[PDB]
Design a protein around this ligand. Sequence first.
Ligand SMILES: OC[C@H]1O[C@@H](O[C@H]2[C@H](O)[C@H](O)[C@H](O[C@H]3[C@H](O)[C@H](O)[C@H](O[C@H]4[C@H](O)[C@H](O)[C@H](O[C@H]5[C@H](O)[C@H](O)[C@H](O)O[C@@H]5CO)O[C@@H]4CO)O[C@@H]3CO)O[C@@H]2CO)[C@@H](O)[C@@H](O)[C@@H]1O
Length: 141
Amino acid sequence: VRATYTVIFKNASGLPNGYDNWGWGCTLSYYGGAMIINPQEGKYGAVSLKRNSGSFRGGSLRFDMKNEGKVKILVENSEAAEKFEVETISPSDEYVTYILDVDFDLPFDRIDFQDAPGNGDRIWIKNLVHSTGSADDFVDP
Ligand SMILES: OC[C@H]1O[C@@H](O[C@H]2[C@H](O)[C@H](O)[C@H](O[C@H]3[C@H](O)[C@H](O)[C@H](O[C@H]4[C@H](O)[C@H](O)[C@H](O[C@H]5[C@H](O)[C@H](O)[C@H](O)O[C@@H]5CO)O[C@@H]4CO)O[C@@H]3CO)O[C@@H]2CO)[C@@H](O)[C@@H](O)[C@@H]1O
């Protein structure tokens, strides 16, 4: 039942080791351990964390987020040039923990957090972890 838990981002102030930002339409900054996305109005901006070597398969994504507007979570396979919409998350003025199943049928090497409405609403992310297992089985490590 045991999963493998990949800690991508926790209490950092820069990009994760082995990840690039393939984002668009935004400024990325940090404060107090949170990644802060400042999207430009009209650009539908996003951070896109690109894993430089290897890929994840299925499993689940866990993260804390607060967000002024609706945020779309996607994964992508850069080799196939395919993207997959995981969930759109409603606004919250406080951090909330999300644990989302990833049902994409390909491996993924990009994880995206996008300003879905394109109004420039800011996004804060902490504590980003992938599990090889399901969201229902995720034991938050
Ligand atoms: O960084 C160097 C690296 O870049 C490589 O090229 C990358 C490029 O940098 C970007 O990462 C690009 O990313 C694109 C995504 O793959 C995906 O296609 C994405 O699709 C967006 C779309 O553009 C738009 O924002 C859309 O907004 C919706 C919104 O979500 C909502 O539904 C609203 O109602 O409507 C709007 C408008 O339709 O949302 C889509 C999903 O997120 O667009 C990204 C930006 O273009 O990928 C490139 C690779 O293909 C290479 O140059 C590489 O060599 C280099 O090293």
